[PDB]
């Protein structure tokens, strides 16, 4: 079976009012992006390459990070989006992201 995994990151920043939320800085990456932040990856717009592909399920969070489970929710935390991520919120974490995945299969 020929199978290909798509992924997309949901990116959030902490705000005194919203907590971790969808309000980002004008300098920040897209709220929905690839791992680099440079590519826009809204989930509903990742298309199948052709009608010969179908999705195996809906999008779901990959609750894994660095070869080990994440905490529930799949979030990882960092001081800023380009910095180093951990499964746990540190005292100086100002951002967080989680990885959504979806498999497509060829017919």
Author numbering: 64 to 170
Copied sentences from the primary study:
Here, we identify TECPR1 (tectonin beta‐propeller repeat containing 1) as a receptor for cytosolically exposed sphingomyelin, which recruits ATG5 into an E3 ligase complex that mediates lipid conjugation of LC3 independently of ATG16L1. TECPR1 is comprised of a central ATG5‐interacting region (AIR) and an adjacent pleckstrin homology (PH) domain with affinity for PI(3)P and/or PI(4)P (Chen et al, 2012; Wetzel et al, 2020). These domains are flanked by two 5‐bladed beta‐propellor domains, whose blades are formed from WD40‐like TECPR repeats. Inserted between the first and second blades of each propellor lie DysF domains, named after their occurrence in the protein Dysferlin and so far without known functions.
However, upon reductive methylation of primary amino groups, confirmed by matrix‐assisted laser desorption/ionisation (MALDI) time‐of‐flight (TOF) and in‐source decay (ISD) mass spectrometry, the N‐terminal DysF domain of TECPR1 yielded diffracting crystals, the structure of which was solved to 1.9 Å resolution by molecular replacement with the NMR structure of the inner DysF domain of myoferlin. The N‐terminal DysF domain of TECPR1 represents an elongated finger‐shaped domain, which, overall, bore high similarity to the inner DysF domains of myoferlin and dysferlin (Patel et al, 2008; Sula et al, 2014a). The N‐terminal DysF domain of TECPR1 is comprised of a central pair of antiparallel beta strands connected via a long loop that wraps around the beta‐sheet and covers large parts of the domain surface. The loop is precisely positioned and held in place through planar stacking interactions between multiple tryptophan and arginine residues (specifically Trp 116, 118, 122, 138 and Arg 159, 161, 165, 167), a feature also found in Ferlin DysF domains (Patel et al, 2008; Sula et al, 2014a). Mutations of W77, L88, L89, I142, K152, K153 and W154 into alanine all abrogated recruitment, while mutations of I65, M80, E134, K135, T147, T149, K150, Y169 had little or no effect. Subsequent mutations of nearby residues R76, S90 and D143 into alanine and C84 and C157 into serine also abolished recruitment. Together these mutants identify a binding site located at the distal end of the domain, that is, the tip of the DysF finger. Consistent with the zwitterionic nature of sphingomyelin, the binding site is characterised by positively (R76, K152, K153) and negatively charged (D143), as well as hydrophobic residues. Notably, W77 and W154 are solvent‐exposed and upon binding may become inserted into target membranes. A comparison of the sphingomyelin‐binding site in the N'DysF domain of TECPR1 to the equivalent region in the inner DysF domains of myoferlin and dysferlin reveals little conservation of loop structures and exposed side chains, thus explaining why the latter domains are not recruited to damaged membranes.
